[PDB]
């Protein structure tokens, strides 16, 4: 047992490792999306920037969990980071929709982790999740919803005009 | 066939995708190393900062290869990123030795990529590898060797004093 | 033989004069395109500015090759600069498509020039081409492809709205 | 007929196209001259700079004419730009004498264009030529005459010392 | 074998040692030339400064090769630095001519080294030579040629006036 | 006989030339030492910086003697500069001991030069040696002794820790 460990259940430790993995996966999905918009045959530079920024943010999310794991005297164990589910993300709209789905999946995981932390009477871990993750998820999901809504209302994905103008005026 | 594609062999395109995967793997190994050093029972904060920096550098290396693939009109295909070979890196000295081994494996891959680009008379690709990668590897390898040497001569990994003082005076 | 000449094949020397001519020709093509967009019946001022910038860049590319010819002790022989293929470039999208084609033609010549320098074991000339020309071409080709893509997806050149908006938001 | 066209004779329009070609030609002559003085066996760097500056000015003279043609609703038609009459310009003195002859030839063209504009009662074209071109030509011709006179009086082009000191003290 | 060594042929190692020696020799030749112009019976202070500057640059060239040797895990072996071939360099012109000959000899050596690096499939070493040495040689040879040409055209070496004025206006 | 020459014995002139050679030799020994410390299997960057500084200082010492020779109207005759006695300097301690031995050998030579200048009643030369050399040697010798002493008392060359810590704390 680590000399620092106190009130940290092994199940919470193991779940924090799985969340680190999910954060690294979300980073990889966004990196994929970013470079999809960087293709010469897609060429939406502000979509590309947006998703790259998101990819770097997910890596910070992962790193803060790894720090947490050591702060609590848990031990990080890493697994493969699986490739994202698509290579071609189809359109600005379709990528935003997949991102929305991803953020809701990461949120579900965080809510299940918080439910475990509660059952294990770990208020430090509860506060960690609430403070650093849960409102970040709500804000992300809201933003992505707003983006989907505007793209759909503008006529996307069939209107390439819509996606060009959203790139410039919302993401730019 | 992409409208931008010119003098870019399918074999080179595939080789760039393998290289992207390896850069992302290298990022992952360093991220693992960094947080090993952040454990309470290891506690070498500058080893931790050093390897986190390397992790971020390797992500940049991957991103630049992704940019190149699109510049040349190739198509990015991402794969699962393999977990690192170790979960526990044993000591500062042993981490730096493994890092040296990693950078030589990445260099070898880049040298093989260059031989391929040479065979396919792709001077743009040769220059990209030279300009952005090959000297970066030579400097990384030499620095890691220098660190290994100092750690050994100081008495590591036997001397916890040695790793402490190297962490302060070299990596701090 | 010039007192400075060393390792500089006569065939290279002649190839360099042909390249000078082609860079001057590309400057003239871009000049022509620029002033087409300045017509009152076309009136896309950022297309005009974009192509004038490209014309001046190609003049600089020619001058750098002239400097190189003298650096190596070759002798410059200039020839008539041929008029561009068109007077009327039809639309923004069609001009961008013609420019892409021109940049791939220029790139092909440079690659043939590099092949010759490699066959003649002239690494100074290889480096000159790589350092100053090949990646400039790859960047210009990628930019033009991105531009063509955007204009297409916006609905050009049928859509005089698409070219107006691209002029403002991308080239502005 | 262009919607902007007013009081602009077809003969003047064609005369403007002829002037554009001649200004481009003059740009090319000066370009050739500049890089002759850059040769290792000539090596007069300020002669080289002086004629490059002149070459760029002539390009601006061409561009301003292209702008004028579109301002008036004429249509630009570009032609082959003929190579200069010499490859080797012999000396600083002899290049200055040929430049003097060039600027007088250009001035004669502009005077004929002015006569035409006068005959066609085109006061806007008369003023354009007077304002932007005729005194620029009188200034250029006086300077080149001054320079030839100094070179002669110093003992060029047989005195390599004369050209060296003129390069330093006048063109520097 | 050094722990850092990778893809570094022993023949390339040995050739880099010989180049270090040639760079140190070029430094010594320029030091000799410098102080020749510092003699009371020659007294051209700007020739003296010129060649001293060149002497210090050659030492930097040597040092960067020694750094390269260690970066690659080669081992520096030094030999005597032979005295330059003259004690009295005769004139400004004659020294510039000997310097030109020296720079062409150093360039030949670098081109032979690059040919060895190519045959040994060492693209790092190729890039090192191209990036840091080959254009430095071309520029040096061109400058020295230009200097010889002007001195000859001015009347040197028989005109001490020529050498005095070149000292002041070109080298000063 | 130089027009400036006064009270300057032929024996002193020859002795100054021997001294120039020895200063250049000292520069070369330090350059060797510096890059021994830059090897990956030695890796003491501040020992490397220290000895490179000394190398540059000794080149300045040589240059000032060359200036003196010309000031007094003597004639510089340069000789082959002997390679240093060692290729491998073994350790920080052993390098500093060899450096101490070198500086005493250079001092001895300067003291012999001074005895000669005294015998020949050349007070200018006596003052030059005193002013510019003798105290510089006494300070160099004392500093090197101080370094040797510290390295020995710390446990070098046995303790790689000792040389590490001296490199950081004294030479850094
Ligand atoms: Fe996240
Ligand atoms: Fe990398
Ligand atoms: Fe070009
Ligand atoms: Fe003009
Ligand atoms: Fe050199
Ligand atoms: Fe000294
Ligand atoms: Mg709270
Ligand atoms: Mg190459
Ligand atoms: Mg361009
Ligand atoms: Mg002019
Ligand atoms: Mg009037
Ligand atoms: Mg290169
Ligand atoms: Mg006294």
CATH of the domain at C109: 1.20.1260.10
Backbone angles phi, psi at B87, to 5 degrees: -100, -35
CA of F70 to the centre of ligand 4 (A): 57
- Contact call for residues D70 and C38 (beta carbons, < 8 A): yes
Backbone angles phi, psi at F147, to 5 degrees: -65, -45
**How many structural domains does chain C have?**
1
Nearest to B56 by CA among B26, B21, B80, B35: B26
Mutate one of E96, E142, E150, E170 to test the D interface: name it (highest D CB count within 10 A).
E150
- Whole-angstrom distance, CA of residue B97 vs CA of residue B85: 13
Taking a 5 Å cut-off on Cβ, the residues next to ion ligand 9 are C 54, 57, 140
Q: In E, which residues are within 8 Å of F83 by CB distance?
A: 78-80
Closest residue in E to C121 (Cα) is: E115
E1, with CB counted inside 10 A (0-12, 13-18, 19+), is exposed
DSSP C7: S
DSSP D73-106: T------PBPPPS-S---SHHHHHHHHHHHHHHH
Experimental method used, please?
A: X-ray
CA of D141 to the centre of ligand 11 (A): 22
- Whole-angstrom distance, CA of residue E148 vs CA of residue E99: 10
D13 is in an annotated binding site: no
Helix residue spans in B38-171 (DSSP H): 45-72, 92-119, 123-129, 135-154, 160-169
Out of E4, E6, E127, closest to residue B130 by CB: E127
CA of F103 to the centre of ligand 13 (A): 23
- Whole-angstrom distance, CA of residue A46 vs CA of residue A51: 9
Q: Which residue has the tokens 């080294």?
A: E113
- Whole-angstrom distance, CA of residue F82 vs CA of residue E154: 41
Q: Which residues have a Cβ under 8 Å from the Cβ of D146 and sit 6 or more positions away?
A: none
- Contact call for residues B47 and B141 (beta carbons, < 8 A): no
CA of A61 to the centre of ligand 1 (A): 5
The tokens describing F40, both together, are: 């990956």
Maximum pairwise Cα distance, chain D: 60
- Per the CB < 8 Å rule, is A43 touching C165? no
Nearest to F9 by CA among F94, F100, F122: F122
Query: Which residues on adjacent β-strands are paired with residue A81?
Result: B81
- Ramachandran area for residue E60 (φ above 0: left; ψ -120 to 50: alpha; else beta): alpha
Q: Omega into E157 within 30° of 0, i.e. cis?
A: yes
Q: CA torsion F30→F32→F33→F34, rounded to 10°? A: 90
Residue-wise over B134-163: b if at least 16 C-beta within 10 A, else e? bebbbebbbbbbbbbbbbbbbbbbeeeebb
- Per the CB < 8 Å rule, is F40 touching B169? no
Q: Which residue has the tokens 């609590």?
A: A72
Which chain F residues touch B if contact means CB-CB below 8 Å? Answer: 40-43, 45, 160-161, 163-165, 168
Mutate one of F164, F168, F171 to test the B interface: name it (highest B CB count within 10 A).
F164
Query: Which residues on adjacent β-strands are paired with residue E27?
Result: none
- Per the CB < 8 Å rule, is F40 touching B165? no
Which chain D residues touch C if contact means CB-CB below 8 Å? Answer: 2-4, 28, 31-32, 35-36, 38-41, 52, 59, 63, 66-67, 69-70, 73, 75-84, 87
- Whole-angstrom distance, CA of residue A160 vs CA of residue A146: 19
F137 is in an annotated binding site: yes
Query: Which residues on adjacent β-strands are paired with residue E81?
Result: F81
Q: In A, which residues are within 8 Å of B24 by CB distance?
A: 28, 81
Closest residue in A to C143 (Cα) is: A40
Q: Which domain holds residue F166?
A: 1-172
- Per the CB < 8 Å rule, is B76 touching A87? yes
Q: Which residues have a Cβ under 8 Å from the Cβ of A95 and sit 6 or more positions away?
A: A33, A36, A37, A47, A51, A89
Angle, vertex CA B34, rays to CA F41 and CA B153, nearest 5: 20
- Whole-angstrom distance, CA of residue F68 vs CA of residue E39: 10
Q: Omega into B157 within 30° of 0, i.e. cis?
A: yes
- Whole-angstrom distance, CA of residue F44 vs CA of residue B87: 32
Mutate one of D2, D40, D43 to test the C interface: name it (highest C CB count within 10 A).
D40
CA of F104 to the centre of ligand 13 (A): 21
- Whole-angstrom distance, CA of residue E87 vs CA of residue E97: 15
- Whole-angstrom distance, CA of residue A52 vs CA of residue A46: 10
CA of C106 to the centre of ligand 3 (A): 7
CA of D57 to the centre of ligand 10 (A): 6
- Per the CB < 8 Å rule, is D81 touching C80? yes
Helix residue spans in A38-121 (DSSP H): 45-72, 92-119
E strands within D51-167?
Answer: none
- Per the CB < 8 Å rule, is B139 touching E71? yes
Nearest to B87 by CA among C32, E163, A74, D148: A74
C103 is in an annotated binding site: yes
- Contact call for residues D83 and D61 (beta carbons, < 8 A): no
- Closest approach of B40 to chain E, Cα-based (Å): 32
- Whole-angstrom distance, CA of residue A160 vs CA of residue A40: 14
Measured CA to CA in angstroms, residue A45 lies from A42, A165, A170, C100, E146 at distances of 9, 12, 12, 19, 48
């Amino acid at each position: 047992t680590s000399q620092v460990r106190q009130n940290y259940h092994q199940d919470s430790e193991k779940a924090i490792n799985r969340q680190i993995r999910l954060e690294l996966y979300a980073s990889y999905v966004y990196l994929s999306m970013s470079y999809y918009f960087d293709r010469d045959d897609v060429a939406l530079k502000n979509f590309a920037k947006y998703f790259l920024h998101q990819s770097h943010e997910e890596r910070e999310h992962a790193e803060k969990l790894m720090k947490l794991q050591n702060q609590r005297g848990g031990r990080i164990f890493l697994q493969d980071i699986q490739k994202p589910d698509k290579d071609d993300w189809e359109s600005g709209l379709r990528a935003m929709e997949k991102a929305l789905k991803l953020e809701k999946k990461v949120n579900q995981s965080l809510l299940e982790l918080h439910k475990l932390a509660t059952k294990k009477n770990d208020p430090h871990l509860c506060d960690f999740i609430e403070t650093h993750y849960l409102n970040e998820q709500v804000k992300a999901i809201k933003e992505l919803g707003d983006h989907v809504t505007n793209l759909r209302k503008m006529g996307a994905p069939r209107s390439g005009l819509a996606e060009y103008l959203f790139d410039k005026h919302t993401l730019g």
